[PDB]
Design a protein around this ligand. Structure first.
Ligand SMILES: *[C@@H]1O[C@H](CO)[C@@H](O[C@@H]2O[C@H](CO)[C@@H](O)[C@H](O)[C@H]2NC(C)=O)[C@H](O)[C@H]1NC(C)=O
Lengths: 6, 116
């Protein structure tokens, strides 16, 4: 999972 | 993070790359810290009189956890050595310890207000 919340 | 003593509301913005403060009802709004802020996620406060410090975590190109006064004056860096993806902060008020996590090195750590 990418860390960027969006 | 809300300030239950000063009646203020703090939040960190990833898109604006700022740390902002406002009243509990949101009447007045200003940008507190924007100088060296790149990707702020974590945020915690210690409003008890005598400490009056705030903490936040940044996962930019030089990730760090920084401490400053809740008015943003005495800005300093406490943890900069073994972090890659600082994600989430919290404060243990009775013992005056700050708990922080990392999503890349996958750990949970706690430390005092001065980073030692
Ligand atoms: C923002 O970051 C820059 C770069 O790290 C800081 O500039 C450094 O400041 C320290 C003293 O605090 C010096 O020892 C370095 O030589 C400086 N580096 C350069 C290339 O200028 C700057 O102080 C920071 N500013 C704020 C407001 O946090």
């Amino acid at each position: 999972x990418x860390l960027x919340x969006x | 993070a809300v300030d239950w003593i000063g009646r203020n509301l703090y939040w960190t913005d990833y898109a604006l790359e700022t740390i902002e403060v406002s009243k509990i009802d949101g009447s007045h709004r200003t940008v507190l810290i924007s100088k060296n802020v790149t990707k702020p996620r974590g945020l915690a406060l210690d409003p008890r009189m005598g400490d009056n410090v705030m903490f936040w975590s940044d996962w930019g190109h030089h990730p760090r956890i920084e401490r400053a006064s809740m008015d943003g004056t005495m800005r300093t860096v406490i943890v900069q050595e073994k972090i890659y993806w600082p994600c989430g902060l919290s404060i243990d008020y009775p013992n005056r310890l700050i708990y922080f996590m990392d999503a890349y090195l996958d750990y949970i750590e706690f430390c005092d207000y001065d980073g030692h």
